[PDB]
Ligand binder design. Structure first.
Ligand SMILES: CCCCCCCCCCCCCCCCCC(=O)OC[C@H](COP(=O)([O-])OCC(O)COP(=O)([O-])OC[C@@H](COC(=O)CCCCCCCCCCCCCCCCC)OC(=O)CCCCCCCCCCCCCCCCC)OC(=O)CCCCCCCCCCCCCCCCC
Ligand SMILES: CCCCCCCCCCCCCCCCCC(=O)OC[C@H](COP(=O)([O-])OCC(O)COP(=O)([O-])OC[C@@H](COC(=O)CCCCCCCCCCCCCCCCC)OC(=O)CCCCCCCCCCCCCCCCC)OC(=O)CCCCCCCCCCCCCCCCC
Ligand SMILES: CCCCCCCCCCCCCCCCCC(=O)OC[C@H](COP(=O)(O)OCCN)OC(=O)CCCCCCCCCCCCCCCCC
Ligand SMILES: CCCCCCCCCCCCCCCCCC(=O)OC[C@H](COP(=O)(O)OCCN)OC(=O)CCCCCCCCCCCCCCCCC
Ligand SMILES: CCCCCCCCCCCCCCCCCC(=O)OC[C@H](COP(=O)(O)OCCN)OC(=O)CCCCCCCCCCCCCCCCC
Ligand SMILES: CCCCCCCCCCCCCCCCCC(=O)OC[C@H](COP(=O)(O)OCCN)OC(=O)CCCCCCCCCCCCCCCCC
Ligand SMILES: CCCCCCCCCCCCCCCCCC(=O)OC[C@H](COP(=O)(O)OCCN)OC(=O)CCCCCCCCCCCCCCCCC
Ligand SMILES: CCCCCCCCCCCCO[C@@H]1O[C@H](CO)[C@@H](O[C@H]2O[C@H](CO)[C@@H](O)[C@H](O)[C@H]2O)[C@H](O)[C@H]1O
Ligand SMILES: CCCCCCCCCCCCO[C@@H]1O[C@H](CO)[C@@H](O[C@H]2O[C@H](CO)[C@@H](O)[C@H](O)[C@H]2O)[C@H](O)[C@H]1O
Ligand SMILES: CCCCCCCCCCCCO[C@@H]1O[C@H](CO)[C@@H](O[C@H]2O[C@H](CO)[C@@H](O)[C@H](O)[C@H]2O)[C@H](O)[C@H]1O
Ligand SMILES: N=C(N)NC(=N)NCCc1ccc(I)c(Cl)c1
Lengths: 171, 48, 347, 95, 99, 140, 96, 174, 112, 83
């Protein structure tokens, strides 16, 4: 067996999205609409390549889009967004249904100042299609050549030559 | 640690295939403090 | 027992066996054995007496133990191959455990002790199921796992069953114990050829079942469970003595009778594989069976034992037992040798 | 199966649970899915006599994923060397 | 962790109360068959068999999330109906009488 | 068994008599222990010591039979200068048969054992020379 | 193999040895039989859970259901034996 | 150390088996199987098998073993023998514990052992899965599938349980 | 095929003749079963229930005929398999060079 | 019918618990096939997204697959929101 090739620690550095899950939860619906393209490109790479080392550049673009997404909230909608995810953060299950009044304020804000429309029920679970210039991998499983099948037996079935040929039998 | 062990190859796979293999718990945390290993292994199961 | 319940229980005995034979999953095989054992215990107990309870308990303990060993082998197989497909096993300890588990179910020596005990303690009709139908499911599993069975274990089990079955029958006056030991020896022939040609395992099994069903059916028609009771047959139904004579000569492997066929064909397959000593030893040991089969023919058909006066009362009444399929079975038990090439249908 | 009623009738009585690369609820994969799939595809249709020889690479990898005996050995080995140097004082763990 | 502590505390407290309940000052200076019916064995065995099938019904709340509702509903009712047949058999064979 | 049996056959005939006698005595003693185990398990001894006595009787008898066979057969090959000769095992097989007659205090068992053990031992030597298979591997 | 399999396998062997080495009570042997099922249940569950073979998650439940049903039958034979002799001692079961 | 919970539980599992397998009074034999059942559930729970662990408590302990003890009181023993009074029970019990202690001592010492077969001693946590972030219990999904994928399992299982009622009623009627 | 008594390819083979000596022997076995049926139940062996004797012969022949078809089919398949393997593996079945007896040396063993 | 009505009245008088059990069990078997809402049960269960919806590699021949989650193509849950 060979050597497992690993990227260097310097290849793995990227600005991190260091916000808590209640913050991601609060912005998730608008994040799904805004950052769909780099997100869906990266997920296509992962299910096609089946190898984390082969999708690191797409992974960094995922972070870069999320950081620009959250900077846009910070520039125009910081106060309505903080009121909303704090409301989410209070719940032990982080429930949307307990925060509709604060969600509406955060939603009226991004729609007005950023043009963001919250995707409708069922939208973010759609299967989509992405145009990637990354070539389709040929042998993602790294399969060896398969063993050759046994020769196919063919022809016309004829009666057994002189029958069963069991000891003395003539049939 | 294995610089002087004779015949050792660093980072050698145990699999014939060169396909990426998901590492198990020991591979990731095999050299780390027991506390992080407790959390990684039994934290979810032991969380109320 | 209500006749409808008896029918449903019998169909459950058959269903569990059929589940074993059609299953591709080890779990369903194990379920089939579990279903089958549950439904057979009540037909062992149906006469409700201490001897039937003892037989049922001994049978339950043996079969339950073998079911646990079988499931242990299956789980070991899962650990080392990650799959449940019924086929060759992927671990030698799994293969040994399953082989011993299946040997116990069949009652092969040295796991044989329960077969004479249990058969004696249950009615003839229940003994007919135990020594015929109950062989199908374990044999059908051996038919599929044989490539991974250890040759020395299987041949050692086969050789012991032929020896124990032969010697065990010499000392018997009870017909059920004679059948039990006769069964143990025949299983040894069946498994001895299995590593070489499973088709000859199936041929031996089918013919053994036919001959075994014939004997049990004839014992039932007269209510004979002992040699001496059977020796009164000449003075009631003379035809039955002739039929019992022919079937006994056939179960002894005498040409030109049907029971010669499985031993003839097994000897051939073994020799084709350069196995001379083993088939020779098996054939000679099988002469032990012929001795105590012949002894029954002497006391039943070829001589006339003393009778009793009350026997005259029996002359006035006909046989009312069903003796279902007996005329067909006895003809197949004795006259099939000219059709030996028909074995290819088992291929 | 002894009698292959299932294939004759086109009914799936128990094939669905036989292997771990078969269809699972919500497409949940088994840990060794890729390894089982590789071995099965290699050995398909050629017979177990050929398979035990010609698909031996795929099967050893599958057994390594199933039980992790080489991996546990390699880790257990690196750990001894570590404890030796720590005790002998020629190694110091990073922070 | 929290569950193991809660369990330890419950039975530790029960142990302490019991042993204390047994030790206090006082101030004192000076293998057969029970004659018990076969009927009670059958109640226990009947409970066991019914309990085993309730084990098979317990997953039903999860099974109703399936897209294969035709099959799920049929199998769920099949099981409960067979459970009812078992009771009807006990009942009509006088397995539930105490006289 | 494989380990001990392979040791016996590895040693050439008529050389290292003591090494041959250890292999047969070990093989014989193991057989006697096997018989004792089943005898004690199936026919229960009256007392613990009686069980120990029975194991010693069977285990010593089997070892003695194996010891004399290995000694007798290997000396004969050495004395006669006939290594690959079945007759050496015929002599060894009969000597072992006589000891059984002695241990069981019977002349009939000794006469029968001589004939039955002698032929069996001689056939084992022909099988070794001729390559006869007892448990033959499936070939066809 | 992992540590656990040693002890679970050891537990199964202990109960099997207990099963094969009867004392007097038939109930004690029935307990060894159910001990074997328990160790089979644990070993099956561990193998199935650790490999994340999802559909087999049901297998151990099936095993428990059938083994319990087998245990109910074994108990029924025990009481029928005890009704005949007044004890469940296996040395009474020697008529055959 | 808590990282060895499964190993420690498996040791208690085995010692409980040496307990009931040495065959004290079936009253105490039943207790040892009950403790093993609880410990056996503990092992399963630490592999993510919450449902399967609880079924051991519900069906094995709460169902089957309750009936075992019930039958023991009726037809086996009402008065238990003093524990380990018999020499065979004491010898086997001590013999079994002695093997378990030696098995444990060497595994802990060397972090491996060869008891007939080779076993590792790093710790059971090493082989655990590292990735997990589905919103469901996989075990529960697999068990729920008994009603969608397992039609055939349900039919044979349900039939067998009905036959169990029929069979046991025949058996005990006398 | 799979779990099929007489697959479709078997229809390429000639059927057994209804005058097949093996089928005649099967019918005789069916006749013998009819006589044994009369004997065990103590009926007149030759005359009793000719309707029942007829169904014995018919059932044996009907089942025997189909068993003989599968028998002959299974030997045809064996031969088809054998010859295909020999054609696929000509290196294992060389056409050996055959000497005449004038060329081959055989030792003489006098019988005196 | 008249004979059946008399039989039902007799068991209503004598075994009202059993009559209720059989009526309820009959409705459990029968009403799912007659109910207009039973079809939404499958649709709702189908619509619940338990795992990630892996995207497709756009090849230029997929006019029915959306490029964005807020595009009009693809399945809609409008029936569910109204329902
Ligand atoms: C009816 C009308 C149908 C018809 O016209 O054709 C029938 C046939 C004529 O057909 P055919 O096309 O003209 O060919 C005839 C050739 O001469 C025959 O052609 P063949 O040379 O191909 O022979 C047929 C072939 C087919 O194999 C057979 O099965 C032949 C029938 C077996 C008869 C053996 C039992 C006697 O036989 C063999 O291959 C080997 C012979 C089998 C010997 C088996 C011996 C081993 C068992 C030991 C038994 C000892 C006796 O006439 C017959 O003789 C009937 C067949 C005999 C059996 C049926 C009658 C029962 C007789 C049993 C007597 C019982 C013994 C009493 C003591
Ligand atoms: C090639 C290899 C060697 C040759 C292989 C040949 C294999 C043998 C073929 C099968 C032979 C079975 C016996 C044939 C029937 C002969 C007896 C008869 O005539 O019954 C007439 C039967 C009543 O006769 P019986 O006076 O009550 O007693 C006749 C025997 O003693 C009653 O004797 P049983 O108590 O043993 O019962 C016989 C029959 C049950 O008795 C029956 O009901 C006759 C059913 C025979 C079916 C024949 C179909 C054969 C074609 C297969 C396709 O068993 C079955 O259910 C057959 C399945 O009349 C019918 O009901 C005809 C069956 C209607 C369906
Ligand atoms: C080819 C072999 C053909 C086998 C045919 C066997 C025919 C059945 C035996 C006929 C004897 C008459 C009879 O009554 O059947 C015996 C038995 C019925 O039991 P009985 O005691 O008479 O009354 C039961 C009511 N409590 O009925 C039974 O219990 C069934 C016993 C036979 C079941 C096993 C048959 C052998 C295996 C068949 C597969 C062949 C491959
Ligand atoms: C064809 C290829 C296959 C070839 C293999 C050979 C097959 C032969 C076996 C066929 C299957 C068994 C059927 C045998 C038929 C027996 C017929 C018979 O013996 O006669 C019956 C006779 C009836 O007696 P009863 O009831 O009293 O009525 C008459 C009034 N006395 O009964 C009696 O009277 C009883 C008289 C006492 C018994 C005398 C014993 C000697 C007779 C032995 C003949 C049977 C030989 C069978 C052994 C196999 C032969 C090779
Ligand atoms: C009583 C006579 C029994 C034979 C004496 C024991 C013996 O020497 O054979 C033991 C046999 C050795 O055979 P083994 O080394 O395992 O190699 C396989 C050979 N085909 O070991 C075996 O594998 C078979 C054991 C045979 C058991 C007695 C039958
Ligand atoms: C399979 C792999 C294991 C191979 C060994 C299998 C041997 C199984 C033997 C089980 C059946 C033996 C039954 C038997 O022979 O009875 C027990 C026998 C008691 O006879 P015993 O007391 O020793 O002789 C003196 C009597 N006056 O006790 C014995 O001596 C039996 C010894 C048999 C040794 C072979
Ligand atoms: C081409 C033709 C071939 C003919 C030869 C073939 C022989 C081989 C086939 C034999 C197969 C077994 C035959 C079945 C036996 C049926 C006859 C029988 O068993 O009883 C003898 C019978 C007595 O007749 P009955 O007075 O009615 O008394 C009946 C008593 N229940 O006897 C009778 O009176 C009926 C007349 C026929 C009796 C046949 C006797 C059979 C003798 C076979 C003995 C075995 C072979 C040696
Ligand atoms: C009667 C009591 C029954 C108690 C049963 C208890 C269950 C015991 C299960 C043990 C399973 C271990 O099974 C055993 O494991 C080792 C681990 O590699 C396997 O492997 C071993 O042999 C093979 C040989 O090719 C190689 O992998 C290697 O030489 C060696 O490691 C064995 O082939 C297998 O037989
Ligand atoms: C004791 C009496 C015995 C009577 C036996 C009666 C017949 C039993 C047949 C049960 C199996 C029926 O047939 C089988 O079942 C279910 C539907 O029901 C189907 O299986 C269904 O569930 C899962 C869900 O994905 C998948 O296996 C499959 O995709 C789906 O179609 C199988 O594709 C079908 O082949
Ligand atoms: C001892 C044997 C006992 C057997 C008991 C069997 C009882 C079975 C009763 C209910 C079986 C059918 O139950 C129900 O029937 C209706 C028929 O409209 C089906 O139909 C419903 O769901 C389907 C899904 O394909 C929709 O497309 C359809 O529009 C809707 O009406 C349900 O999918 C099915 O769940
Ligand atoms: N000889 C084995 N051990 N097995 C086996 N039956 N191999 C197949 C050889 C064979 C023999 C007869 C026929 I008819 C057919 Cl079709 C094929």
């Amino acid at each position: 067996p060979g050597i497992v090739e690993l990227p260097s620690l310097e290849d793995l550095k990227v600005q991190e999205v260091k916000v808590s899950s209640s913050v991601l939860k609060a912005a998730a619906h608008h994040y799904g609409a805004q950052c769909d393209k780099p997100n869906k490109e990266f997920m296509l790479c992962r299910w096609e390549e089946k190898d984390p080392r082969r999708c690191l550049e797409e992974g960094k673009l995922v972070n870069q889009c999320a950081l620009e997404f959250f900077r846009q909230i910070k520039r125009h909608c910081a106060e309505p967004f903080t009121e909303y995810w704090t409301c989410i953060d209070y719940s032990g299950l982080q429930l949307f249904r307990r925060c509709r009044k604060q969600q509406a304020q955060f939603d009226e804000c991004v729609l007005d100042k950023l043009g963001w429309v919250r995707p409708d029920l069922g939208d973010l679970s759609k299967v989509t299609k992405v145009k990637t210039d990354r070539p389709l991998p040929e042998n993602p499983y790294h399969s060896r050549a398969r063993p050759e099948p046994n020769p196919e037996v063919e022809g016309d079935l004829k009666p057994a030559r002189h029958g069963s040929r069991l000891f003395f039998w003539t049939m | 640690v294995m610089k002087d062990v004779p015949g050792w190859k660093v980072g050698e796979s145990v699999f014939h295939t060169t396909r990426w293999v998901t590492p198990m718990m020991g591979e990731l945390y095999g050299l780390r403090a027991s506390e992080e290993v407790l959390s990684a292994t039994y934290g979810f199961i032991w969380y109320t | 027992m209500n006749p409808i319940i008896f029918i449903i229980i019998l169909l459950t005995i058959m269903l569990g066996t059929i589940i074993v034979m059609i299953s591709s999953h080890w779990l369903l095989v194990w379920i089939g054995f579990e279903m089958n054992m549950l439904a057979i215990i009540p037909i062992m107990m149906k006469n409700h007496n201490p001897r039937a309870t003892e037989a049922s308990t001994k049978y339950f303990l043996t079969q339950s133990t073998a079911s646990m060993l079988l499931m242990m082998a299956v789980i070991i197989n899962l650990m080392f191959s990650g799959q449940w497909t019924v086929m060759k096993l992927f671990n030698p300890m799994a293969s040994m455990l399953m082989t011993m588990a299946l040997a116990m179910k069949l009652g092969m020596a040295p796991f044989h002790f329960w077969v004479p005990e249990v058969t004696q303690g249950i009615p003839l009709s229940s003994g007919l199921i135990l020594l015929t139908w109950q062989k199908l499911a374990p044999m059908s599993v051996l038919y599929q796992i044989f490539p991974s069975i250890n040759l020395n274990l299987i041949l050692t089990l086969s050789v012991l069953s032929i020896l124990i079955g032969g010697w065990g029958g010499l000392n018997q006056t009870q017909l059920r114990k004679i059948m039990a030991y006769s069964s143990i020896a025949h299983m040894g022939w069946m498994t001895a050829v299995l590593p070489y040609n499973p088709t000859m395992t199936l041929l031996n099994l089918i013919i053994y079942i036919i001959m075994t069903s014939t004997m049990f059916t004839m014992f039932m028609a007269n209510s004979t469970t002992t040699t001496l009771s059977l020796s009164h047959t000449w003075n009631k139904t003379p035809i039955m003595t002739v039929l019992i004579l022919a079937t006994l000569l056939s179960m002894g492997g005498l040409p030109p009778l049907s029971g010669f066929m499985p031993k003839w064909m097994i000897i051939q397959e073994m020799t084709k594989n350069n196995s001379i000593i083993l088939p020779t030893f098996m054939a000679i040991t099988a002469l032990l069976n012929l001795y105590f089969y012949m002894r029954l023919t002497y006391s039943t058909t070829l001589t006339m034992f003393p009778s009793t006066n009350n026997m005259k009362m029996k002359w006035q009444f006909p046989l009312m037992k069903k003796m279902t399929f007996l005329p067909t079975m006895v003809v197949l038990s004795t006259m099939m040798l000219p059709l030996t090439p028909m074995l290819s249908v088992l291929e | 199966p002894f009698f292959d009623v299932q294939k004759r009738l086109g009914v799936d009585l128990d094939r669905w649970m036989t292997i771990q690369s078969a269809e699972q609820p919500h497409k949940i994969p088994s840990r060794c899915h890729a390894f089982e799939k590789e071995w099965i595809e290699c050995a398909h249709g050629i017979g177990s006599i050929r398979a035990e020889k010609e698909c031996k690479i795929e099967f050893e990898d599958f057994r390594e994923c199933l039980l992790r005996q080489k991996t546990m050995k390699r880790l257990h080995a690196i750990r001894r060397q570590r404890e030796k140097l720590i005790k002998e004082g020629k190694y110091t763990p990073p922070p | 962790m929290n569950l193991m502590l809660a369990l330890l505390t419950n039975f530790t407290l029960a142990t302490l109360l019991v042993i204390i309940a047994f030790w206090l000052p006082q101030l004192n200076v000076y293998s057969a068959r029970l004659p018990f019916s076969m009927k009670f064995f059958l109640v226990a065995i009947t409970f066991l068999l019914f309990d085993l099938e309730i084990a098979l019904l317990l997953p039903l709340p999860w099974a109703s999330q399936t897209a294969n509702l035709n099959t799920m509903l049929t199998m769920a009712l099949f099981l409960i109906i067979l459970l009812a047949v078992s009771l009807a058999y006990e009942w009509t064979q006088k397995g539930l009488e105490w006289t | 068994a494989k380990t001990v049996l392979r040791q016996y056959w590895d040693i050439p005939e008529g050389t290292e008599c003591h090494r041959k006698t250890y292999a047969t005595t070990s093989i014989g003693g193991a057989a006697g222990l096997v018989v004792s185990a089943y005898s004690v398990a199936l026919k229960t001894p009256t007392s613990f010591l009686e069980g120990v006595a029975r194991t010693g009787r069977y285990t010593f008898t089997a070892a003695a039979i194996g010891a004399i066979f290995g000694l007798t057969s290997c000396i004969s090959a050495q004395v006669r200068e006939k290594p690959d000769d079945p007759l050496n095992y015929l002599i060894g097989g009969c000597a072992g048969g006589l000891i059984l007659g002695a241990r069981t205090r019977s002349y009939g068992i000794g006469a029968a054992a001589c004939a039955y053990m002698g032929l069996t031992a001689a056939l084992v030597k022909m099988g070794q020379l001729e390559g006869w298979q007892v448990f033959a591997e499936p070939k066809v | 193999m992992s540590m656990v399999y040693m002890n679970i396998m050891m537990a199964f062997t202990v109960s099997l040895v207990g099963l094969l080495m009867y004392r007097s009570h038939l109930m004690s042997s029935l307990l060894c039989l159910e001990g074997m099922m328990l160790s089979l249940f644990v070993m099956a569950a561990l193998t199935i859970l650790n490999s994340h073979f999802t559909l087999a998650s049901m297998m151990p439940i099936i095993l428990l259901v059938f083994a319990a049903c087998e245990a109910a039958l074994g108990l029924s034979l025990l009481v029928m034996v005890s009704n005949t002799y007044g004890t469940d001692y296996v040395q009474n079961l020697n008529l055959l | 150390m808590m990282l060895y919970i499964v190993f420690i539980l498996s040791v208690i599992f085995v010692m409980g088996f040496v307990g009931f397998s040495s065959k004290p009074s079936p009253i105490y034999g039943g207790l040892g199987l009950i403790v093993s059942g609880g410990v056996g559930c503990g092992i399963v729970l630490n592999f993510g098998g919450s449902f399967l662990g609880l079924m051991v408590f519900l069906i094995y302990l709460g169902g089957m073993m309750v009936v075992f003890g019930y039958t023991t009181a009726m037809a086996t023993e009402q008065y238990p023998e003093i524990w380990l009074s018999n020499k065979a029970v004491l010898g086997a019990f001590v013999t079994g514990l002695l093997m378990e202690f030696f098995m444990v001592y060497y595994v802990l010492k060397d972090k491996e052992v060869e008891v007939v077969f080779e076993f590792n001693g790093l710790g059971d946590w090493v082989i655990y899965d590292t990735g997990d972030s589905g919103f469901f219990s996989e075990e529960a999904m697999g068990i729920a599938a008994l009603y969608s994928y397992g039609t055939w399992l349900v039919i044979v299982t349900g039939w067998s349980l009905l036959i169990g009622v029929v069979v046991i009623m025949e058996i005990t009627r006398g | 095929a799979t779990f099929q008594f007489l697959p479709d390819e078997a229809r390429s083979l000639p059927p057994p003749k209804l005058t097949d000596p093996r089928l005649a022997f099967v019918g005789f076995l069916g006749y013998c079963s009819g006589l044994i049926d009369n004997a065990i139940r103590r009926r007149p062996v030759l005359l009793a229930g000719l309707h029942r004797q007829l169904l014995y012969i018919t059932s044996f022949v009907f089942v025997g005929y189909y068993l003989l078809k599968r028998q002959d089919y299974m030997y045809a398949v064996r031969d088809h398999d054998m010859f295909s393997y020999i054609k696929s593996h000509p290196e294992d079945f060389p056409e050996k060079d055959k000497k005449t007896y004038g060329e081959v040396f055989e030792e003489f063993h006098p019988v005196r | 019918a008249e004979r059946v009505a008399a039989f039902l009245k007799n068991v209503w008088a004598k075994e009202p618990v059993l009559v209720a059990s059989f009526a309820i069990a009959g409705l459990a078997v029968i009403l799912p096939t007659l109910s207009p809402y039973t079809k939404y049960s499958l649709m709702i269960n189908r619509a619940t997204p338990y795992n990630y919806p892996v995207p497709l590699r756009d090849d230029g021949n997929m006019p029915d697959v959306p490029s964005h989650p807020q595009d009009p193509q693809g399945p809609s849950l409008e029936w569910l929101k109204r329902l």
